[PDB]
């Protein structure tokens, strides 16, 4: 049926094609997924947006990168949260978008919540931003007007649509920055070295946070921990939690003019005596040692977290991935050989871990190339 190019969108880790000395978030140690899709004749682009920023801030950045222009976070939103209204300036990867072009988004991890929110803003705008604009006589980003539907279909991989319990870990703060550290390591990048090039830009202009000359990432992360991008409600950290994801689900709905596709991942085995889930062999070392124990055993009746939630891919509960449920009116149906419009098409669950699926961690039985080509083909169908 269609011609749409594909835009790749990372999660709460992630970086541009030139960052990390060319080590690709999409493809990691296996290769360059964008290159493969392009070689195969599927036109593909990569967005880079603040890994730790809220989905709102991320969707605003994404809008700017796509159509070109200066990031506008909304004057009501920036006033409420205490950060800059305008951010950086982009050329635009897809100027055709201005004349009725369309796209497909392939989104990993938190990128899936962002892709959802982008769609919902494009279609509906923000009532709150429209009113704050009229009321204080300031300018409004066209992102907030509504009526701008240009995303034809959204595909999510290992997305915490309902939040992930990782956030409830007692040392979640130190362990989450340890993961940024791990993803760094997998790119042959030290955390105790004060690099002179950017390497990994967290894109915190709006918070006025930037890494300093002679500052290592270890040192940078300590500061980040104490900044509003870790401690405010306007953070990846918040939209990632269970209550945070459910809040997003209350206003971020499936558009009827988009097709939605979900892929779940798992890398655990159930223990028969405990009913706990444990990391399979070959699961990435950091999630194996640090995150998966906790994820496979944390229950919390007040949060409605029971045995359903224990299966996981090393970072996100598997139950969370098939589509938003908590606080949502979206429909989820299992893939029947056809992609239905306006609902979540549950493409099933793959025995792959969170970082193996984008190839950041090796997995020789996972045929990452055929995986992505099949996705590309399905989107074109
Ligand atoms: Ca592995
Ligand atoms: Zn913000």
Question: 69: which strand partners?
Answer: 90
Q: How far is the CA of 362 from the centre of ligand 1 (A)?
A: 5
Q: In angstroms, what is the span from residue 282 Cα to ligand 1's centroid? A: 4
Q: Which residues are catalytic?
A: 109, 313, 354
Q: Report CA dihedral (336, 341, 347, 352) to the nearest 10 degrees.
A: 170
Cα separation of 55 and 238, whole Å?
10
Q: How many CB atoms lie within 10 A of CB 266?
A: 22
Residues making up the binding site for Ca(2+): 282, 356, 361-362
Ligand 2 geometric centre to CA of 205 (Å):
11
Strands (E) in 2-100, as ranges, are 6-9, 44-47, 69-72, 86-90
SS3 190: coil
How big is the chain, counted in residues? 381
353 touches 287 (CB < 8 A): yes
Task: Report the C-alpha gap between 49 and 95 in whole angstroms.
Answer: 19
3-state secondary structure of 44: strand
Strand stretches in the chain, DSSP E: 6-9, 44-47, 69-72, 86-90, 103-108, 151-157, 259-265, 268-270, 277-279, 332-334, 344-350
DSSP state string for 230-287: HHSSSBHHHHHSHHHHHHHHHH----TTSEEEEEEE--EEE-TTT--EEEPTTS-HHI
- Residue 66 CA to ligand 1 center (angstroms) comes to 33
Do residues 150 and 97 make contact, with C-beta atoms less than 8 angstroms apart? yes
Alpha-carbon distance of 246 to 129, in angstroms, equals: 22
For ligand 2, a single-atom ion, the residues with CB < 5 A are 57, 81, 234
The CATH number for 1-381, chosen from 3.20.20.70, 3.40.50.300, 3.40.50.1820, 3.30.2420.10, is 3.40.50.1820
The resolution of the experimental structure, rounded to one decimal in Å, is: 2.3
């Amino acid at each position: 049926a269609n011609d749409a190019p594909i835009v790749l969108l990372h999660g709460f880790t992630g970086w541009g094609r030139e960052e990390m000395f060319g080590f690709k978030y999409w493809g990691g140690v296996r290769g360059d997924i964008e290159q493969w899709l392009n070689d195969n004749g599927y036109r593909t682009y990569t967005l880079a947006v603040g890994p730790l920023s809220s989905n709102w801030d991320r969707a605003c950045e994404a809008y700017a990168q796509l159509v070109g222009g200066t990031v506008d976070y909304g004057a009501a939103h920036a006033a409420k949260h205490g950060h800059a209204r305008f951010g950086r300036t982009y050329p635009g990867l897809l100027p055709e978008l201005k004349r009725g072009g369309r796209i497909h988004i392939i989104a990993h991890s938190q990128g899936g919540q962002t892709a959802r929110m982008l769609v919902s803003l494009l279609e509906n705008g923000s009532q709150e931003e429209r009113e704050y604009a009229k009321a204080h006589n300031v300018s409004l980003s066209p992102l907030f007007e509504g009526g701008h539907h240009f995303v034809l279909s959204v595909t999510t991989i290992a997305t915490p649509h309902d939040g992930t319990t990782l956030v409830n870990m007692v040392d979640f703060t130190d362990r989450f920055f340890d993961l940024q550290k791990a993803v760094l390591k997998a790119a042959a990048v030290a955390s105790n070295v004060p690099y002179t090039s950017q390497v990994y830009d967290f894109k915190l202009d709006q918070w006025g946070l930037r890494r300093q000359p002679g500052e290592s990432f270890d040192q940078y992360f300590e500061r980040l921990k104490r900044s509003p991008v870790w401690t405010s409600t306007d953070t990846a950290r918040y939209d990632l939690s269970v209550p945070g994801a459910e809040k997003l689900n209350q206003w971020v709905k499936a558009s009827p003019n988009t097709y939605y596709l979900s892929f779940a991942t798992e890398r655990t085995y159930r223990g028969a005596l405990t009913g706990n889930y444990y990391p399979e062999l070959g699961m990435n070392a950091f999630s194996a040692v640090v995150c998966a124990p906790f994820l496979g055993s944390y229950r919390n009746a007040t949060l409605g977290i029971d045995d359903r939630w224990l299966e996981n891919d090393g970072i996100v509960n598997t139950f969370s991935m098939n589509g938003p449920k908590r606080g949502s009116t979206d429909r989820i149906v299992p893939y029947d050989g056809t992609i239905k419009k306006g609902v979540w098409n549950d493409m099933g669950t793959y025995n792959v871990d969170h970082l193996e699926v984008i190839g950041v961690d090796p997995n020789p039985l996972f045929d990452i190339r055929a995986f992505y080509l099949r996705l590309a083909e399905q989107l074109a169908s």
